[PDB]
Target: plakophilin 1
Amino acid sequence: GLTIPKAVQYLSSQDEKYQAIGAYYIQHTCFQDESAKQQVYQLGGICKLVDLLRSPNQNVQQAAAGALRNLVFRSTTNKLETRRQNGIREAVSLLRRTGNAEIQKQLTGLLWNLSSTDELKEELIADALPVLADRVIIPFSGWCVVDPEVFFNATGCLRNLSSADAGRQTMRNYSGLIDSLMAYVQNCVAASRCDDKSVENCMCVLHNLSYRLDAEVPTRYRQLEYNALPEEETNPKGSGWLYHSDAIRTYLNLMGKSKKDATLEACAGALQNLTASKGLMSSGMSQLIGLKEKGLPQIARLLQSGNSDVVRSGASLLSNMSRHPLLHRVMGNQVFPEVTRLLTSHTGNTSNSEDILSSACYTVRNLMASQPQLAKQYFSSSMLNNIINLCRSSASPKAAEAARLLLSDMWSSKELQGVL
Model:
């Protein structure tokens, strides 16, 4: 015969020769159509394939594995059911005892697909994360074989998990994980493979694990904060890297060489998160960025990107740094020109540009307070015109406010009126 309906059944009977054909058949057939997925689903193929993984034949193992990976791909339904059928439990119990590269690629690709389903992540970080951190991720970076693709899917998987409050706080504590993700990115940067296969994933996981850091992971900054400069761990361990100048440099490195916006946004992103804290860690981190690793350049360069999601991060980053006095000089010598142009064109007509503005304004206010002259040098007639309206433009409360706020806070000094 051939068809789906029979394949589903082909799965159930004892001859592995017809158990192989089964999943394999529904793997392709049900690759890119979305209707054969409905079928297999409402046909109970989910369950059938879920068991077969226990099977003694690698093929009936590959077959079921893939069939599942594809069956789920982009389908809230099939995902949910894949769990209800006791699969997240079965997929992981296969990675633990497998030497097959293809089986590892499939199971891992499967799991990746599941992690995008915003809710059932919890059982993944609970039961999936470990096997991935151990058998795939760690032994790939050599943080002491694993196929480059298995690591790809795994890091993809963790990239989604690093998205929930729990996953973030579980990896920051899972011994050797960040340590490894860290090697790989660093390794790739030396190999001059800034856009290597899984750098973006890894760079995203780190972006995510750097969210609200001074608020969660304890450090010297928080201590220096209770009884009131820090050294900086000599031997950063896991959670420890996220705030080390070693990583800042590796990020800033990716930033200037990468060709992927996705990656640029992460690099910019993590720096943004590390410097959100309005506390003391934000001041040190800002300094370690703009002063020790002298990174203003690669950041203010992002501001010209032909991608708004990218300019967002840069300016979002520039703004926070501008909050600390120690970076006013340095920022004035290398950021003012580029932020200004980026405040003469951004109308605030996008969900982003309203952000780019709220940031490129806060930035100028913070900076200009310390040295009027910088205003006299970059506030171009146009840049000047293009900001009043903003205060009016009721179509952008956000931009407006910071825009007029940048204006009023622009008459708070004797040397301020000049131009206008």
Notes: The chain has one domain: 1-410. The domain at 1-410 is CATH 1.25.10.10 (Leucine-rich Repeat Variant). The radius of gyration is 26 Å.
